[PDB]
Design a protein around this ligand. Structure first.
Ligand SMILES: O=C(O)c1cc(C(=O)O)c(F)cn1
Ligand SMILES: [Mn+2]
Lengths: 18, 429
């Protein structure tokens, strides 16, 4: 799931380390 | 207090302490080759293996290397498989493995490590709390919910489990129910409860049910640093960006984009209507629980700076037109989409996730009356062929009390004060 109009997901970004 | 040496490792404590001293003093290259020698001489030593892993972990930080860190992650697992691993060392090694797996984005691998941890220490409350987060990070709110129900069946006042449980409830639209859990858990003060998410959602929960103390909590969130202001409650922010709810084209600097949208508005409309008319599945219902009532669907051409090629087949001229404007097609924290709303619709007051975008609304089909959008303290209406611009990180709210359908075009742009490097580097949202 993605945060499009709101902040529904536990986290809105997909981290990739360094 | 940590008991990291089994009986065998105590027989070589001097060699292990020498190697670790090198690491604590920053001689990583020297420490790497010391623990390598120990792992070679003592293949069955848990402490030598953990030192190797910690040195790889340190070396990954120094070089900023994901590949090096992937090697550390495997060595941390080797520690857990060796003979007679002390419990404290087993927990440390697998916890760090899962943490580093999360750092890399290996959320599924972290979840597996977390399931093994909780299986090895059934009584460690914090490991279950972390297991729940592991589920949340893969979008599995059903398993996450069970974990936190288990936890506070054992430990009813664990503040961490309370806010996470209330967050899950609110996501499932258990608005009234989620309030006590979110509320109590913040007042607890436990580690991990001072999180903007929980301030954000508690206030929103209270707002939806008419509980007029919601803004008391927003101001609190502001005091804790989570919100730029009580009105602008986005959580993924770049500090210092000009903050105002409504913008003019001139203020954004994107005047050629605004002109292209308005000058070509009938073409944009007709392609959007043509997609509606084919009545395939391209217009998707809004699915973020933002509707009190009514019908609201969206047809997306771009998201996270990625062009939806199939969508653009249905609006090919509109997509060709927009390619001239990287300020929107490359806005990896926004979308480009049509939005249709029908009569009897009310969208709850809400905020977007980030302050790094502005939203342009182009009117395409606007009934003469009944359609309103409020942002902050100002309520405006759309006009066909005209662009409105607002910062959706401010609280905003929409009504559709007209007699027929309303269609707009939504074009997100980078906030104008973001530098080229920031626009290339910010994580997509
Ligand atoms: O662009 C936005 O953030 C937005 C747009 C609408 C709409 O009217 O389509 C809405 F109801 C809520 N938010
Ligand atoms: Mn919105």
């Amino acid at each position: 799931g993605k945060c499009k109009d709101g902040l529904g997901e536990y986290t809105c970004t997909s981290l990739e380390g360094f | 207090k940590p008991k990291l040496l089994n009986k065998f490792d105590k027989t070589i404590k001097a060699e292990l302490d020498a190697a670790e001293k090198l690491r604590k003093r920053g001689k990583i290259e020297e420490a790497v080759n010391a623990f390598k020698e120990l792992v070679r001489k003592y293949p069955q030593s848990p402490r030598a293996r953990y030192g190797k892993a910690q040195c790889e972990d340190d070396l990954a930080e120094k070089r900023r290397s994901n590949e090096v860190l992937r090697g550390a992650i495997e060595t941390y697992q080797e520690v857990a498989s060796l003979p007679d691993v002390p419990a404290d060392l087993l927990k440390l090694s697998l916890k760090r493995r899962s943490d580093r797996q999360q750092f890399l984005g290996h959320m599924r691998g972290s979840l597996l490590t977390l399931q093994r941890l909780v299986q090895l220490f059934p009584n460690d409350t914090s490991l279950k709390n972390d297991l729940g987060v592991g589920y949340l990070l893969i979008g599995d709110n059903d398993n996450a919910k069970k974990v936190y129900e288990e936890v506070l069946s054992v430990t009813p006042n664990d503040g961490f489990a309370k806010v996470h449980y209330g967050f899950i409830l609110k996501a499932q639209n258990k608005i009234a129910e989620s309030i006590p859990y979110l509320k109590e858990g913040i007042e607890s003060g436990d580690p991990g409860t001072d999180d903007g998410r929980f301030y954000f959602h508690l206030g929103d929960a209270m707002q939806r049910v008419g509980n007029k103390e919601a803004y008391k909590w927003y101001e609190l969130g502001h005091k804790r640093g989570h919100f730029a202001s009580v009105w602008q409650r986005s959580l993924y922010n770049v500090n210092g960006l000009k903050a105002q709810p409504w913008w003019t084209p001139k203020e954004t600097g994107y005047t050629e984009l605004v002109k292209s949208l308005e000058r070509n508005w009938k073409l944009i409309r007709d392609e959007g209507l043509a997609v509606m008319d084919k009545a395939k599945g391209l217009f998707l219902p809004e699915d973020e629980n933002l509707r009190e009532k009514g019908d609201w669907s969206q047809f997306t051409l771009w998201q996270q700076g990625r062009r939806n090629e199939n969508a653009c087949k249905g609006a090919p001229k509109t997509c060709t037109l927009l390619e001239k404007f990287p300020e929107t097609t490359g806005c990896r924290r926004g979308q480009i989409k049509y939005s249709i709303m029908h009569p009897g619709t009310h969208v709850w007051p809400h905020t977007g996730p980030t302050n790094c975008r502005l939203r342009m609304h182009l009117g395409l089909v606007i009934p003469k009356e009944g359609c309103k959008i409020r942002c902050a303290n100002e309520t405006k209406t759309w006009e066909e062929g005209k662009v409105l611009i607002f910062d959706d990180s401010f609280e905003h709210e929409v009504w559709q009390d007209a007699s027929s359908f309303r269609l707009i075009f939504i074009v997100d742009v980078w906030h104008p004060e973001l530098t080229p490097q920031q626009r290339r580097s910010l994580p997509a949202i």
